[PDB]
């Protein structure tokens, strides 16, 4: 449980999705250069993601266009990794009985989440907190 609640979101990983952030109304984007951000452009070719489960509640978020894995570094910066490693795992949970939240597994004890600012920039791990809108995501069909 990693010392966290276990309310899981409904749905599956059968198909790819878009991870939509309410905060600024952005879709999670993994750039070929390893850069990660958010875009409002629904036609962007780098927003399609494939989630997969490691263990129950643990996921990988992979770019279908590039094959890169979403990850969060030692300093809390989100990046795109060519290969899957411990920094690529996230704890996917339901939040506010509706949204999906993604907590860095490696940094779970610190509550470091995946989050997008209103300007579409990713937030740094330590800057994320329960209660913010930046951490709330909606998985949409592609």
What domains are there in the chain, each with its CATH number?
1-142 (2.80.10.50)
At what resolution in Å was this solved? Answer: 1.9
Q: Of 66, 41, 61, whose CA–CA distance to 50 is shortest?
A: 61
Binding-site residues sit at 23
How far does the chain reach from its first CA to its final CA, in angstroms?
Answer: 30
Please tell me the experimental approach by which this structure was elucidated: X-ray
Residue 59 half-sphere exposure toward CB, CA atoms < 13 A: 21
Secondary structure percentages of the chain, helix, strand, coil, to 5: 5, 35, 55
The separation between CA 69 and the C-alpha centre of its own chain, rounded to angstroms, equals: 10
Rounded to whole angstroms, the Cα distance separating 114 from 101 reads 7
Q: Of 75, 73, 76, whose CA–CA distance to 85 is shortest?
A: 73
- The long-range contacts involving 27-35, CB below 8 angstroms and separated by at least 24 positions, are 28/61, 28/70, 28/114, 28/116, 28/137, 30/63, 30/65, 30/66, 30/68, 30/70, 30/80, 31/80, 32/65, 32/66, 32/68, 33/80, 34/68, 34/79, 34/80, 34/81, 35/79, 35/80
Within 8 A by CB and 6+ apart from 42, the residues are: 18, 27
Give 97's DSSP letter. T
**78-81 and 58-63: which strand pairing?**
unpaired
Binding-site residues for heparin sit at 23
Partner residues linked to 49 by β-bridges: 17, 63
Rounded to whole angstroms, the Cα distance separating 127 from 129 reads 7
């Amino acid at each position: 449980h990693h010392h966290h609640h276990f309310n899981l979101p409904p749905g599956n990983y059968k198909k790819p999705k878009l991870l939509y952030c309410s905060n600024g109304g952005h879709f999670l984007r993994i750039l070929p250069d390893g850069t990660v951000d958010g875009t409002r452009d629904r036609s962007d070719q780098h927003i399609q993601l494939q989630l997969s489960a490691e263990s129950v509640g643990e996921v990988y978020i992979k770019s279908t266009e590039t094959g890169q894995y979403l990850a969060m570094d030692t300093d809390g910066l989100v990046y795109g990794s060519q290969t899957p490693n411990e920094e690529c795992l996230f704890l996917e949970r339901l939040e506010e009985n509706h949204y999906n939240t993604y907590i860095s597994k490696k940094h779970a004890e610190k509550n470091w989440f995946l989050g997008l600012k209103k300007n579409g920039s990713c937030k740094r791990g330590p800057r994320t907190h329960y209660g913010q809108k930046a951490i709330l995501f909606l998985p949409l069909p592609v």
